[PDB]
Amino acid sequence: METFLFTSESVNEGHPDKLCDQISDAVLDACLEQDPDSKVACETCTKTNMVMVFGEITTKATIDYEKIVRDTCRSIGFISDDVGLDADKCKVLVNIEQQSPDIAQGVHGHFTKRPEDIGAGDQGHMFGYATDETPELMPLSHVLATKIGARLTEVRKNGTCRWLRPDGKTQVTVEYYNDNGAMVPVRVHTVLISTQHDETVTNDEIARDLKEHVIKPIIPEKYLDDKTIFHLNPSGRFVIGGPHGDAGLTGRKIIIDTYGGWGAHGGGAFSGKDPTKVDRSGAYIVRQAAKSVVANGMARRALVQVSYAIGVPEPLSVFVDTYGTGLIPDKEILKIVKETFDFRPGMMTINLDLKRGGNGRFQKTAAYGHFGRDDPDFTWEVVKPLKWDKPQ
Amino acid sequence: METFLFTSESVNEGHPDKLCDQISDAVLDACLEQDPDSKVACETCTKTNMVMVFGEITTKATIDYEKIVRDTCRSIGFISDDVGLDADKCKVLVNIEQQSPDIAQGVHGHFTKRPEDIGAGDQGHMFGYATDETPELMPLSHVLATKIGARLTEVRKNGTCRWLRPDGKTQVTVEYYNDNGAMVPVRVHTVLISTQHDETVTNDEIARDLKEHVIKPIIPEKYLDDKTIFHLNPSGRFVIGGPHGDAGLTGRKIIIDTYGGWGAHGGGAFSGKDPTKVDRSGAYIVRQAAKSVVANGMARRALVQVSYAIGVPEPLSVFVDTYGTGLIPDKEILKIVKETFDFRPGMMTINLDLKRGGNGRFQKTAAYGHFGRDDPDFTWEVVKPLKWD
Ligand SMILES: Nc1ncnc2c1ncn2[C@@H]1O[C@H](COP(=O)(O)CP(=O)(O)OP(=O)(O)O)[C@@H](O)[C@H]1O
Ligand SMILES: Nc1ncnc2c1ncn2[C@@H]1O[C@H](COP(=O)(O)CP(=O)(O)OP(=O)(O)O)[C@@H](O)[C@H]1O
Ligand code: MET
Ligand code: MET
Ligand SMILES: [K+]
Ligand SMILES: [K+]
Ligand SMILES: [Mg+2]
Ligand SMILES: [Mg+2]
Ligand SMILES: [Mg+2]
Ligand SMILES: [Mg+2]
Ligand SMILES: [Mg+2]
């Protein structure tokens, strides 16, 4: 049986880049809760004892940027210089201005353009992907790395591993077989975790606890064997973490946000962006398309690209590829996708309910990936029925 | 003839995200020039009247961060509030500290580990890609978007289009034919440019000038026809730009830095990173491997993944896929790539000469893409001979 090794990583919510995504999306949530028509382009960065929120917001909302920043950091567990950032000591810089009027006239006519006439908030390209290899129609390498990172957070919060600190990363190498273009996981080859820790725990205790409390409960037993490789805190010490160890920025985890290196990426970040930014609304809709093609049994795997021009409602290009797993030709799947899905940003916003913030609607997307989640707020995970001649 | 549409974009050196990449790599260059063993992790961000350099540097170098920032902005053409940032008046913030000692012990033993023992400076995965569809073994959608963006900067600087301002973007949609897994460009479907401009030029003049001075000189005539679509400054006004129009950050153009959506990306940014950061040295080596497989005639297309753990010299995984274009099996190409290439970071650094800064060695990688360039400083663009039958 010929196989190959494919690797995906993740980080948890205490990773300093993920912190920035969550602050950017906490700001988006706060704007939309008061003004659903908010134009939001909120970037965040962090380093030792410093968070800065910067970029462009036009909102009728009254927003306390400082509070949102400190509250977000506090909830993730950045509550002392000892764990790499103190939410209640750190400098909070704010360099927020209104959206460029040159952008605003072209995109939405300063909040006068009707939904079907709203232009793309910028140019770019976006991909959606789905694979039948997991029930959430996501790649197993990604899913396993992601769920391990979430389990790492959970055993700190639930008091199972009292020695953990917020900042952690994971990486899973899966051995795969190609079944007529479909991806069939064989076994997990290598599992890696690097997690921040206090000074009370030995490397033997870290290794024991990570294997028993974190990795074993998440990876299906059928994928683990006596030859599976384990790298557990390979640096040998990870006491210094969060912004103290490593500068964070919004949009530096776009592959961890998406498909772990499977499918494709157009390069646009998600977090801190209102849905006129097709970086977000476009990627969500082409995930809905890719997932719908696979969930309807039209294909075992699907990749969809869309592209846009700033100020133009209609996409410049659309493609569908099923890696030869389609039960009808890709040209016919492309025709069905284009008849079923409205790629116009004004339409995507309403059709996926993307102007709703609050109850951390977008903050939830900013850690543990945007795709393959079952929370009803993830509206682009809802499968659309597709009209086709489905085999008996 | 059955075809499909594939789109790639670019931005030029005046795009605020690309400005950040160039500042981050200007800081790397400046450190390496004095201290080749500099540990550099320099992030940059920018918004109206403000640039900030932040992250971690351990260097024996004496560095003027403010001068490097202002010189980099000045050279790109950010010389007034009128064109979106004033290199001589903007606030320059600096939050640079030394590398975490916890990282330093694990990666390089505080500058004591020998090359073969240097660990990956972090975990992660990187892909390299090559395609025989262009002489540079890069995807045509990416190459055309990139070369159009570079021509856009050129006609501003050389005084061909004097209305231009530094900040511009491109996108090209190519109609492709699949030839048994190989990619064969048929024609250019859609060309888009959005460029910053002064108040002295009409939208009709912009469209005329961009077609005649920027697009026509770059796109091969064989790819352009009467049905090619043009979007030329479709927003209708792009007077405000650079940091004034839009916040920039290092590492927010990783697809424009690489293959324009072709192949794959592991998510690691390049700019501001010394070569112990396998995000950079790992991506460079797997581009060299993918390109070498294609240039040796082993395949018409090649994707190579490598992955690492922090502190471990040897990669955790390697894969080769030729999209069914391989003339020998992918398992055998993987065996030749692993016998030919040394993926240990301490060895990659020396083998690609990545500790040399100066004459903007890394600053030049920080706009117009890291791959498919002819400049001899792009050491990873050198084809290695591969032994096969
Ligand atoms: N008035 C205008 N009309 C058209 N384009 C404009 C414009 N003002 C600015 N732009 C361009 O649009 C660019 C934005 O590109 P991106 O950086 O791709 C946006 P982003 O939302 O930060 O997404 P990213 O995640 O891809 O960085 C600006 O930096 C500039 O080149
Ligand atoms: N001592 C240590 N041992 C192991 N891991 C550590 C560590 N100190 C920090 N790390 C982890 O390594 C992370 C670095 O993750 P990344 O953000 O991927 C690095 P980067 O150079 O910024 O690349 P990027 O482009 O992927 O963002 C830190 O944020 C932290 O989680
Ligand atoms: C076209 S620049 C990208 C969007 C811009 N940041 C805004 O505020 O809408
Ligand atoms: C493992 S954290 C990423 C690297 C870090 N910025 C450094 O200073 O080396
Ligand atoms: K960093
Ligand atoms: K931005
Ligand atoms: Mg990072
Ligand atoms: Mg106060
Ligand atoms: Mg973009
Ligand atoms: Mg940007
Ligand atoms: Mg990384």
Side-chain angles (χ1 to χ4, degrees):
Chain A
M1 169 195 59
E2 272 187 353
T3 66
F4 63 83
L5 300 175
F6 197 110
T7 299
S8 305
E9 54 167 5
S10 190
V11 307
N12 65 9
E13 68 193 51
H15 187 279
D17 284 336
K18 240 58 203 82
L19 178 57
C20 289
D21 289 317
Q22 292 164 89
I23 294 167
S24 289
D25 270 338
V27 171
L28 170 62
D29 284 338
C31 295
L32 289 178
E33 172 193 50
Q34 293 181 51
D35 176 6
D37 298 323
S38 291
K39 301 293 164 273
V40 185
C42 185
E43 315 282 25
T44 310
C45 68
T46 185
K47 179 59 202 160
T48 311
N49 203 42
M50 191 271 290
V51 181
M52 179 190 287
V53 288
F54 65 106
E56 307 82 36
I57 301 178
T58 310
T59 193
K60 301 184 284 215
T62 304
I63 297 302
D64 183 350
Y65 294 100
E66 198 190 357
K67 178 168 200 323
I68 296 168
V69 170
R70 292 194 194 280
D71 280 357
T72 309
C73 294
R74 198 179 301 106
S75 63
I76 287 161
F78 286 113
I79 64 163
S80 83
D81 293 316
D82 268 1
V83 306
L85 175 75
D86 191 333
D88 292 298
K89 278 168 151 59
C90 68
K91 196 200 313 167
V92 177
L93 302 182
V94 179
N95 294 117
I96 301 278
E97 309 290 350
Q98 285 199 358
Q99 176 182 61
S100 161
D102 293 359
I103 300 185
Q105 63 78 25
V107 170
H108 54 87
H110 292 281
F111 310 87
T112 62
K113 278 176 194 223
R114 299 170 177 196
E116 71 265 29
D117 295 321
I118 295 285
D122 188 21
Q123 68 171 55
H125 64 105
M126 304 89 204
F127 297 94
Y129 182 73
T131 168
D132 66 350
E133 71 196 77
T134 61
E136 51 265 72
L137 303 185
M138 293 293 282
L140 183 69
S141 60
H142 169 88
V143 165
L144 287 186
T146 305
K147 284 175 177 171
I148 293 165
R151 182 66 180 166
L152 182 60
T153 290
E154 176 178 35
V155 295
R156 176 173 57 92
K157 284 177 179 177
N158 77 6
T160 291
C161 298
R162 286 189 191 284
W163 53 264
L164 281 159
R165 286 175 168 176
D167 177 8
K169 316 184 66 173
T170 67
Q171 183 171 280
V172 176
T173 307
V174 173
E175 185 161 348
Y176 279 95
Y177 168 83
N178 176 0
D179 181 9
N180 282 279
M183 294 294 103
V184 185
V186 176
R187 55 175 291 271
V188 168
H189 181 277
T190 302
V191 182
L192 164 63
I193 303 178
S194 296
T195 185
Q196 198 193 7
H197 64 89
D198 71 22
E199 300 268 36
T200 72
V201 66
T202 74
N203 278 319
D204 283 343
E205 293 173 326
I206 289 173
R208 170 195 64 198
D209 275 16
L210 284 186
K211 194 169 330 200
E212 296 306 324
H213 301 301
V214 184
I215 297 163
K216 276 177 66 175
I218 298 303
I219 303 172
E221 171 157 46
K222 70 171 154 195
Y223 293 135
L224 285 177
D225 63 35
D226 301 326
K227 292 195 198 320
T228 303
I229 297 172
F230 292 92
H231 293 285
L232 308 171
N233 275 30
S235 80
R237 185 188 162 86
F238 190 173
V239 173
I240 296 168
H244 188 198
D246 182 48
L249 301 87
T250 299
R252 281 287 290 274
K253 293 286 167 282
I254 68 174
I255 299 303
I256 279 167
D257 275 345
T258 56
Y259 304 108
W262 290 99
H265 207 294
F270 295 160
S271 281
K273 294 181 183 173
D274 79 75
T276 55
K277 285 73 172 167
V278 283
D279 283 329
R280 187 181 217 149
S281 56
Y284 288 2
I285 209 72
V286 294
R287 163 65 176 166
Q288 190 180 33
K291 185 180 189 174
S292 290
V293 164
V294 171
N296 278 259
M298 218 173 258
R300 296 184 61 183
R301 262 175 101 200
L303 183 69
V304 181
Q305 194 188 42
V306 68
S307 63
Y308 297 94
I310 191 184
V312 180
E314 304 82 18
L316 265 42
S317 68
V318 183
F319 95 63
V320 174
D321 190 74
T322 65
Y323 306 87
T325 75
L327 297 194
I328 57 171
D330 287 5
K331 155 182 197 218
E332 319 194 349
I333 296 172
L334 171 67
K335 170 181 142 292
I336 287 163
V337 165
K338 284 154 83 72
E339 293 179 355
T340 308
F341 291 87
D342 197 334
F343 289 111
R344 298 174 292 184
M347 308 304 285
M348 299 189 295
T349 299
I350 297 153
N351 286 340
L352 287 173
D353 189 31
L354 300 181
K355 279 183 172 186
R356 182 167 62 75
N359 269 10
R361 192 282 174 91
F362 288 114
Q363 195 178 324
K364 277 183 287 151
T365 77
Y368 314 115
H370 297 248
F371 308 137
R373 316 260 298 264
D374 28 50
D375 180 332
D377 281 337
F378 290 68
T379 45
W380 49 96
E381 293 292 317
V382 170
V383 168
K384 288 202 80 150
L386 271 44
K387 189 202 286 208
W388 74 292
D389 288 339
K390 187 159 175 36
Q392 175 84 49
Chain B
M1 173 162 61
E2 276 201 294
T3 65
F4 63 84
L5 301 179
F6 196 107
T7 299
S8 304
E9 55 163 6
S10 199
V11 305
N12 65 10
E13 71 191 59
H15 186 280
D17 282 331
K18 235 62 200 78
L19 173 55
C20 289
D21 290 319
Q22 292 164 89
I23 294 170
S24 288
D25 269 340
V27 169
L28 169 62
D29 281 339
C31 291
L32 287 181
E33 220 171 78
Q34 294 179 48
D35 176 4
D37 298 328
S38 291
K39 302 290 162 274
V40 185
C42 184
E43 315 280 18
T44 309
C45 67
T46 188
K47 181 59 202 160
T48 310
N49 204 39
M50 192 269 283
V51 178
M52 181 186 255
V53 291
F54 65 105
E56 308 81 35
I57 301 173
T58 307
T59 192
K60 303 186 277 173
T62 304
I63 292 304
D64 181 349
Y65 293 102
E66 197 195 346
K67 184 161 188 317
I68 294 164
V69 168
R70 298 198 187 282
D71 284 348
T72 308
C73 294
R74 196 174 305 102
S75 63
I76 291 167
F78 286 114
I79 63 156
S80 83
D81 304 337
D82 275 344
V83 304
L85 176 74
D86 193 326
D88 288 301
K89 287 169 153 55
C90 64
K91 196 174 53 149
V92 178
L93 306 185
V94 179
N95 293 119
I96 303 273
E97 316 215 291
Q98 286 204 340
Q99 177 181 57
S100 162
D102 292 3
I103 296 179
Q105 63 79 21
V107 173
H108 54 86
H110 293 281
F111 309 88
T112 60
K113 280 176 193 216
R114 298 157 171 206
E116 68 256 39
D117 296 330
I118 294 287
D122 188 18
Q123 72 172 52
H125 64 105
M126 311 82 204
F127 300 86
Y129 183 74
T131 167
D132 64 355
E133 69 198 76
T134 61
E136 50 267 72
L137 303 187
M138 293 293 280
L140 180 66
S141 59
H142 167 91
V143 163
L144 290 183
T146 303
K147 289 177 167 176
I148 290 163
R151 181 64 177 156
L152 182 58
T153 289
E154 182 187 27
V155 296
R156 175 173 55 92
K157 287 176 171 179
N158 77 1
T160 295
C161 301
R162 294 186 163 283
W163 50 264
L164 277 164
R165 288 173 167 179
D167 181 6
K169 317 184 65 171
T170 68
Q171 183 171 289
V172 179
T173 308
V174 174
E175 183 166 351
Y176 279 94
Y177 171 82
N178 174 356
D179 183 12
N180 294 307
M183 298 291 102
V184 185
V186 178
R187 56 173 294 272
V188 170
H189 181 278
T190 300
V191 181
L192 165 65
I193 308 188
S194 287
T195 187
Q196 199 191 4
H197 63 91
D198 71 21
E199 300 272 32
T200 71
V201 66
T202 75
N203 277 320
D204 279 351
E205 293 177 319
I206 288 174
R208 169 199 64 199
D209 275 16
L210 282 189
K211 182 171 294 180
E212 293 303 322
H213 300 298
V214 186
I215 295 161
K216 279 177 58 173
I218 295 304
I219 303 188
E221 322 233 349
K222 65 171 105 222
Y223 293 134
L224 285 177
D225 63 34
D226 294 331
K227 301 128 182 288
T228 305
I229 298 167
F230 293 81
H231 289 290
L232 302 166
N233 272 31
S235 83
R237 187 179 166 89
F238 189 173
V239 173
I240 294 167
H244 189 202
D246 181 51
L249 299 92
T250 300
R252 282 288 292 271
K253 294 284 166 283
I254 69 173
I255 296 294
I256 277 165
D257 276 343
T258 55
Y259 304 108
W262 291 100
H265 206 296
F270 293 159
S271 283
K273 292 181 187 175
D274 80 77
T276 53
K277 284 74 172 166
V278 281
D279 287 326
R280 183 175 222 152
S281 54
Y284 289 2
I285 209 75
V286 292
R287 163 63 178 169
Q288 190 179 33
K291 190 182 182 167
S292 290
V293 167
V294 174
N296 279 262
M298 293 197 168
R300 297 184 65 183
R301 262 172 100 199
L303 185 68
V304 180
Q305 191 191 43
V306 68
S307 67
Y308 294 98
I310 190 181
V312 184
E314 301 83 17
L316 266 51
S317 72
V318 184
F319 93 65
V320 175
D321 189 77
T322 65
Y323 303 89
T325 77
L327 296 192
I328 54 174
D330 288 359
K331 172 205 185 72
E332 188 188 331
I333 297 167
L334 172 68
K335 168 188 140 284
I336 290 159
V337 162
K338 287 156 84 103
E339 294 168 339
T340 309
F341 291 81
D342 196 336
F343 288 103
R344 297 175 298 192
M347 310 300 292
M348 298 191 294
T349 300
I350 295 161
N351 289 332
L352 287 176
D353 188 30
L354 301 176
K355 281 180 170 187
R356 182 171 63 77
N359 289 327
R361 192 281 173 88
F362 288 113
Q363 195 179 329
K364 285 175 289 170
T365 77
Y368 313 115
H370 296 246
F371 310 138
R373 313 264 296 262
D374 258 336
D375 181 330
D377 283 340
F378 291 68
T379 45
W380 49 96
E381 292 294 317
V382 175
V383 165
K384 291 210 86 169
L386 302 182
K387 188 201 293 218
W388 72 293
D389 306 295

